[PDB]
Paper text:
The human mitochondrial AAA+ protein LONP1 is a critical quality control protease involved in regulating diverse aspects of mitochondrial biology including proteostasis, electron transport chain activity, and mitochondrial transcription. The LONP1 protease consists of an N-terminal domain involved in substrate recognition and oligomerization, a AAA+ (ATPases associated with diverse cellular activities) domain that powers substrate translocation, and a C-terminal serine protease domain involved in substrate proteolysis. Here, we determine structures for human LONP1 in three different states: substrate-free, substrate-bound, and both substrate- and bortezomib-bound.
We show that in the absence of substrate, LONP1 adopts an open, left-handed spiral conformation that is bound to ADP and has its protease active sites organized in an inactive conformation. The substrate-free human LONP1 reconstruction identified in our dataset was resolved to ~3.4 Å resolution, which was sufficient for atomic modeling of five of the six LONP1 protomers. The uppermost subunit of substrate-free human LONP1 hexamer demonstrates substantially more flexibility than its bacterial counterpart, as it is only discernible at low resolution in a subset of the particles. Due to the low resolution of this uppermost subunit, a copy of the middle protomer from the five-subunit spiral was rigid body fit into the low-pass filtered reconstruction for representational purposes. The presence of a fully ADP-bound LONP1 conformation, despite incubating the sample with saturating amounts of ATPγS, likely stems from two factors: the LONP1 sample was purified without supplementing ATP, and the presence of contaminating ADP in the ATPγS stock. According to the previously proposed mechanism of substrate engagement, the topmost subunit of the left-handed spiral is the first to undergo nucleotide exchange upon interaction with substrate, followed by subsequent nucleotide and substrate engagement events that lead to a reorganization of the AAA+ domains within the hexamer into an active state that is competent for substrate translocation.
Residue numbers in the entry:
A (entry chain A), B (entry chain B), C (entry chain F): 421 to 595, 603 to 947
Write the structure that this text describes.
C-alpha cells in the first residue's frame, strides 16, 4: 500500500524496514514462497496505525452521564474513570493506565468495561488468558514456522486500527506470565516487539482493563504493576433495581417482545431473586428472566394469549416450583453448631461449623487420659494450625470460666469447618471454631441469628479479617440480625451503603471475652 | 466460476480480497507452484456461500407435529425448540442459539438433532470431537502447510450451502478447547477467521447443538456459555414404546423385512428389555433387536421357514439364554448392607454399601482402645472426608439412641462403598453409610426394598442431592418399592411423569432420625 | 551490509567467520530459505557493537552530583560507585564489576541503578530471571533451530549498541543458575559462546547489577562472584524526606498539576506514613500519594474548586478512614507473650510469641508425669530443635532460680511462634521463647515496651544474630523503647544513623541471666 503508509506518522526504523521490504518485493519473482512471505509481512507492517489515535471524550459531565445511565452502582469504578478523565485533561496527550476489576462472577465487570470504552470514545478489544498456555498467542512467533500469525495483539491493532484500543484481558487470575509482564509494564511498554514482527510497537497509551474473581492468584509480577478495584455483589434490593432497569428490558429486546406484552412485577422479580437464585451476581437471575420471556414469547406466537402478565400466582407455569425453598441449613442451631461468614471465590457465604463428640466421655480419669480433636473440611497447613490454636484457647478459656467443666480437656471431638472459603480467609473461622467448641462443651446453643467472623490467637485477641462487604452481603441474604466483627474492621463496615446495614446489630470486639458475652 | 461469485449476494469485504487474489491467479498461467493451489484458494471461497440463509419454517403447529412424530418423550428438548421457533418468528429474522443436551448413552440426542434440523428446515451437519486433539481439524491449516484442509466449519458451509445449518458437535464432554470456545462464543462469533481462509464468516445464525454424557467434564468457559438441557433415561414401558414404534421399524428397514415378513411381539420385547439389557438407554436394546432381525432374515432367505414370528419360547432359538437372570446383587440383605442409589456417568444405578468386621471383638481391653474403620472403594479425598463424617455421626447417634451398645465406638470395621457414582455425586451415599454402620452395629437388616439417598451432616441434617430422575428410574428398575429422599428434593420428585413414580412409596426427610425410624 | 564494519573494530577471529559466511552466501542463489537464513545470521552478527565504548563520564564530582541529586540515602551504594569510578579512572578502561543489591521491596533497588547508568553515561538495560525456568531465554539457540533469535544479551547489544551496557538482572532470588554463573564469571566473562553466535562474545567490560530481597536463596555458586551491598528500609523521618523531595513532585508531575494548585502538608505526609502504610519501603506510599493527587486533579478539572490544600482534617475525604489504627497487637502484654523483633523477607517486623497451658495443672498429683510442649507456627527442623533447646533451658533456669516452682517441668504448654521470620533467622527467637515460657510459669508479664532477640543454647549463652538494622527499624516503627541484643552486635548497632538509634535504650547481653534481670 501507499496511502496507508503516507497518511500515518511512522518512525525512521519502520521506514527503513518497509523500504527493504519493497526492495525485496522488487527482487523476487511471482509464484514463490519467498514472495508470499515478503508480501504478507508487508501487509502486516502496513496495516498498523502509527500515530493514528481516536479523539477521546473528555467532558466530565458527559462521561458521568454516560457511565451512570447504563449501569447501576459500581461507584468506585465510576470515580476511578472520572479521575482518569480529569488527569488526561490536565495533561496534554492520552494516559493509558492499567486497571483490574476483581469480584464475584456476574456483577458487571465486562459490561462496565464496554461502557468505559463507550464513554472514552476509544475503540475496544478483549481476549481471555484463562485458557492460554502459549507465549505465542501474545507475542507471536517468527515467520519461519509454517503456521504464522501475530499473537492477538497485532491481531488486535489490526482489527481495531487505533493507537489506544482499551484492551480487556479477561480472567487474569486463571492463567505465559512472561509475555503478560512484557505487555503490562510502564517501562517495558513503549517497545513491545512481538516475535512475528521484528519492529517494536508502541502501546504505552492503551489502557488495559483486567478481570478476576480473586486477587490472591494473579501472579505478583503482574499484581504489583496493576491497580486493583473491587466490584462487589448486590443485595436483594439492588438485584431488583438492576433487574427492573436493565435485565428485563434487554431480555425483552432479545426475545423480540415489548413492555406492552410481557409484564414482570416487582413481586415476581423478588420471588425470583429470593427463591430461584442463590449467587451474589445477576447471572442466574438473568437466566431465569430469559426463560420467563421465552415462554412468554411462545405463549404469544402460539396464541394462548395476546398479552402475558407474570404474577406470583402464575409464576410456576413459566419457570416452575422454587428451587431454593429454605433460607439457611439450620433454623435454630443445636449446641455444637455456629454460623460463620466465609469469603469464597464467588462472594460470601454463611457456612456452619459443626462439632460433635466422637467417643463416650464415660471416664473418671484414672490417669492422664488426654482429649483429642479430629478435623475435616480439606484443611491446609495454615488452617490446621489455626484449628489447633483455636482448640487450645477454647481449652484455656473454659479452664477459667468454669473450672468444674472438664469437657473440652478429657473428651474426643470431631470438628467440621465446611470447604467454602479461600486460603487467605481460611483462618478467619477462628472465633467460630472457638464458639462451636465452647457451645458443645457447655451444652448451650448460640444466640439464634448470630453470625461471626474474625481471627483468634492463643491469648484470645481478635485479629482483623478481609472481605467485610461480601461477608455482610452474605449474612444479609441469609437472614441474619446480629453480627460480630473484629473492632479493627469498623472502617470497612461503616463505609457500606445504608442498604446493607439496615437491621444488622453489629458488635465490634477486641477480645473473645466479648464474643462469649454476646453469644450467650 | 465468476458466475458463481457474481450470483452470490454481497460479500463485499471478502470480494475486495477476492479480486485482489483472483485477478492475480488468473494472471498467472498453469504449471505454477503457486497458481495450481491458488486456484483452490479461489474455488473454496467461491463454494462457500455468503448471503443465502435457507428458508426456515416458523409454523408452530407443523413444527410440533413433526417433532412429536419421530421421537418419543424428550419434551424438554421439544419445548425448548418450540420456544426457539416462536422467538425466531417474533424477531423478523433467524437468530441462532447454542444448546447442549446431556444424558446417559442411548437416549436419542443425535437422532433428535436430526429431527430438529428437518423440523426447522435448516440444513444438517454433525461431527465428533471425542478424541480430537489438534486444532488442525476444528479450524483448518494455512497455505504454508503441505496439506490443504479448511477445517470442519468451512467444510459444513460447503456441504450445506447455507449460513444456518444447525451444526451438531458430539461428545463435547470428551475433548483443543480454545477453538471450540472461539466457535461457540457470541463474543468471538460474528467473525470466525479460519486458517485456510483469512476471511471472517457470520456464524451468529447457525444453531449449535452439543451432546455430552456428563456436564461436569465440559470445561467451564463452555459450560457457562452453552444452555444445558437434560435428556433423561427411559422407564420400562417407555423403552417398550420406543422399541415398538421406532427400533423394530428401523431394524426392519435395515434388514429388508416387513410386518408380515418378520414380526416381534410386545411380550417378547418386554422379556428382552428385562432379561437381556441393563442400561438406561436403548442402545443395547436396539442391538438385540437388530441381531434377532438378522437371524430372522437368515432363516427366511435360506427358506428354513416362512412368515417368521418371534415368540418368548422360540426367542432362545435367536439369542439364547438370558444375560441378567437376577434383578440385583441381593434380594434379602444381611446385616450391614444397604441399597443406595447412585448417579453414574451411565445414568442412574443401584449399588450396595457393605460393612464387615475386621478384627475379633472379644477383649477386656485395658486402656479402652479406639475403634477403627477401613474404607475401600477407590475414593477421592472428598469421599474420604464424607465417610469420616458419616462414621462420626453413626457413632454419635448410637451413643445416645442405644447407650449400652459399644459396637461402633470400640470395634474394627471395614466399609466398602462400591464405585459407580460421579465425583460430584460422591458424598451422596452418606445416609446409606450411616445406615450400613448402624444396621451392622445393631445386628438387624434394613427393610427389604429400601433404597435411599441423601447427604448427611455431622449433626445429622439430610442435605439435598442431584440426579433424582435417574436415581428414581434406577430404583424403579431394581424392584425398589420405598425410596427415601431429602425433603428439599420434592421439587425434583413430584414433577416426574405419572408412570415413573407409579408404584413407589416415597419418604421425604430432613434429619436422619426419620431415616432411622423408616429403615428400622 | 558492510558499511557497518567499514568503520568498526572487529577481532581477527570473528573476521574469518564473517568472511567465510559472506563467501558461502555469495555462492548460493537468492529467493531461497537458506539465503534468508544466512542473511539473518549475518545481520545478527553485524547488528552488535564490537569496539565502540560509550564515552563514560569520569568526573568524580559530576557523578557524585548526579547521584546525590536524585536519591536520598543509600550511602553504601553511592560510596561504592564513587570508588568504582575512581578505579575506572586509575585504569585505562574498566572491567564492569559484578554487584548485587538486597533489601526489602520498595527501597530503590532499581531507580538507583538507572541513576548509576546516568552517572556513568552508559545506557540502561534490564531483565528478570525470577519467573523464568529455562536457560533458553539467556543462552539462545543454535543455527540448526527451526527459527530462532539469540540470547538476551544479544537483544541488549542490539538495543544499546555499545560494548559496556550496564544491564540489570532482577529477582535473582526466584530462579539455569549455572548459566547465570557462566555469564557472571570473570575468567569466562570474555567468552559467552551463545549457540546463535559461534564466535566468543566478550563481556569483560559491562557491569552487571542484580537485585534481591534476601541473600540466602541466591545459590552459593552465584553468590561467590557477587559483591553484596545492602539497601535497607527507612524510618518515619526518612520516609517523610523522600516523600517531600521525590514522591510528591514525581506524582504531581505524573498527574499534570503544579505546586500551587495541589500541596500536601508535612502533617498529612506523616499521617500517610504512620497510618495508611505498614511497610519498610515507600512502595505503598507512592500509591497513597498519587491517589490523593488524582482525586485532587478530579476536584480541579471538574470545577469543584480552583485550588486544593490537603490537610490532616480533610484527608479522609481524599483517601478514607485510617487503615492501620493499631501500632501492634498488644499495648500491654499478658503473662506469656513477648515481642519478638523478627527479620522477614519483607523487612523487619515485630512478632509476638504466646504460651497458653493447654491442659489443667492436676494439683501436684503423686505421679512423675513429665510436662510437654506443643508448638505451632509452621516451623522447620532447625526451629523445632531450637524450641526444644529453649524449653530445656527454661526448665533448668526455673529449677535453679525458683526450685519450689513446678510449672514448666510438670505442665503441658502450647507455644506459638508467629510464622513471619526467614529460615536462617528462625533461631533468633530463642530468648523470646525463654522469656515467654518463664513469664507464663512465674505468672507475671514482661516489661511493657521491651523487645528482644538473640540465639540461646542449653547453658543459656546468647549467640549473635543478623538483620540488626531491619530489626531496629521495625522496633522503632512498633513504638518500642527498650531493645535487648546479643553483646556481639554492637558493631552494627552503633554504626547506625542517629535517626534510628535515638529513642531506644539498648541492653547488650551475653547470658540469659541479664535478659531475666531486665525483663523482670
Ligand atoms: N450494575 C449493573 N447494571 C447493569 N447491568 C448489570 C449490572 N451488574 C450486572 N449486570 C448485568 O449482568 C450480566 C453479567 O455479565 P458480565 O458482567 O459480563 O459477567 P462478568 O462480571 O463475569 O464479566 C451482564 O449482562 C450485565 O448486563
Ligand atoms: N425417545 C426416542 N424416540 C425414538 N427413538 C429413540 C428414542 N430414544 C432413542 N432412540 C433411538 O436410539 C438411537 C439413538 O442413539 P443416540 O442418541 O445416537 O445415542 P447417544 O444418546 O449416545 O447419542 C436411535 O436409533 C434412536 O432412534
Ligand atoms: N532512597 C530513595 N530515594 C529516592 N527515591 C526513592 C528512594 N527509595 C524509593 N524511591 C522511589 O520509590 C520507588 C521505588 O520503586 P522501586 O525502586 O522500583 O522498587 P524496588 O526498590 O523493589 O526496585 C521509585 O519510584 C523511587 O523513585
Amino acid at each position: 500500500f501507499r496511502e496507508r503508509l503516507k497518511e500515518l506518522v511512522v518512525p525512521k526504523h519502520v521506514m527503513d524496514v518497509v523500504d527493504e521490504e519493497l526492495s525485496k518485493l522488487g527482487l523476487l519473482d511471482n509464484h514463490s514462497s519467498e514472495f508470499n512471505v515478503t508480501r504478507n509481512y508487508l501487509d502486516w507492517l502496513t496495516s498498523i496505525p502509527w500515530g493514528k489515535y481516536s479523539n477521546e471524550n473528555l467532558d466530565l459531565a458527559r462521561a458521568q452521564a454516560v457511565l451512570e445511565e447504563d449501569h447501576y452502582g459500581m461507584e468506585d469504578v465510576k470515580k476511578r474513570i472520572l479521575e482518569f478523565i480529569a488527569v488526561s485533561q490536565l495533561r496534554g496527550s492520552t494516559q493509558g493506565k492499567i486497571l483490574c476489576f476483581y469480584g464475584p462472577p456476574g456483577v458487571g465487570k465486562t459490561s462496565i468495561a464496554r461502557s468505559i470504552a463507550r464513554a472514552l470514545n476509544r475503540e475496544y478489544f478483549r481476549f481471555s488468558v484463562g485458557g492460554m498456555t502459549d507465549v505465542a498467542e501474545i507475542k507471536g512467533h517468527r515467520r519461519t514456522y509454517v503456521g504464522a500469525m501475530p499473537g492477538k495483539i497485532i491481531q488486535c491493532l489490526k482489527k481495531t486500527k487505533t493507537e489506544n484500543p482499551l484492551i480487556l484481558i479477561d480472567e487474569v487470575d486463571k492463567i505465559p506470565s512472561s509475555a503478560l509482564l512484557e505487555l503490562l509494564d510502564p517501562e517495558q511498554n513503549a517497545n513491545f516487539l512481538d516475535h512475528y514482527l521484528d519492529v517494536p510497537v508502541d502501546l504505552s497509551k492503551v489502557l488495559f482493563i483486567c478481570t478476576a474473581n480473586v486477587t490472591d492468584t494473579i501472579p505478583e509480577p503482574l499484581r504489583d504493576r496493576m491497580e486493583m478495584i473491587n466490584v462487589s455483589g448486590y443485595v436483594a434490593q439492588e438485584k431488583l433495581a438492576i433487574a427492573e432497569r436493565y435485565l428485563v428490558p434487554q431480555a425483552r429486546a432479545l426475545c423480540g417482545l415489548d413492555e406492552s406484552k410481557a409484564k414482570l412485577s416487582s413481586d415476581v422479580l423478588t420471588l425470583l431473586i429470593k427463591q430461584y437464585c442463590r449467587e451474589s451476581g445477576v447471572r442466574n437471575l438473568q437466566k431465569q428472566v430469559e426463560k420467563v420471556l421465552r415462554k412468554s414469547a411462545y405463549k404469544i406466537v402460539s396464541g394462548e394469549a395476546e398479552s402475558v402478565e407474570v404474577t406470583p400466582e402464575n409464576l410456576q407455569d413459566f419457570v416452575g416450583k422454587p428451587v431454593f425453598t429454605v433460607e439457611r441449613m439450620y433454623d435454630v442451631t443445636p449446641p455444637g453448631v455456629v454460623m460463620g461468614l466465609a469469603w469464597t471465590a464467588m462472594g460470601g457465604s454463611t457456612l456452619f461449623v459443626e462439632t460433635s463428640l466422637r467417643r463416650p466421655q464415660d471416664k473418671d480419669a484414672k490417669g492422664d487420659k488426654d482429649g483429642s480433636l479430629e478435623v475435616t473440611g480439606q484443611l491446609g497447613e495454615v488452617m490446621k494450625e489455626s484449628a489447633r490454636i483455636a482448640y487450645t484457647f477454647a481449652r484455656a478459656f473454659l479452664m477459667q470460666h468454669a473450672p468444674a467443666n472438664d469437657y473440652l480437656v478429657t473428651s474426643h471431638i470431631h470438628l467440621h469447618v465446611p470447604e467454602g472459603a479461600t486460603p487467605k480467609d481460611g483462618p478467619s473461622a477462628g472465633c467460630t471454631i472457638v464458639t462451636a467448641l465452647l457451645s458443645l462443651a457447655m451444652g448451650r446453643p448460640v444466640r439464634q441469628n448470630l453470625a461471626m467472623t474474625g481471627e483468634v490467637s492463643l491469648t484470645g485477641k481478635i485479629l482483623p479479617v478481609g472481605g467485610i462487604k461480601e461477608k455482610t452481603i452474605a449474612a444479609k441474604r441469609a437472614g441474619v440480625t446480629c453480627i460480630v466483627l473484629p473492632a479493627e474492621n469498623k472502617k470497612d463496615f461503616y463505609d457500606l451503603a445504608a442498604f446493607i446495614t439496615e437491621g444488622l446489630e453489629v458488635h465490634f470486639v477486641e477480645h473473645y471475652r466479648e464474643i462469649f458475652d454476646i453469644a450467650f
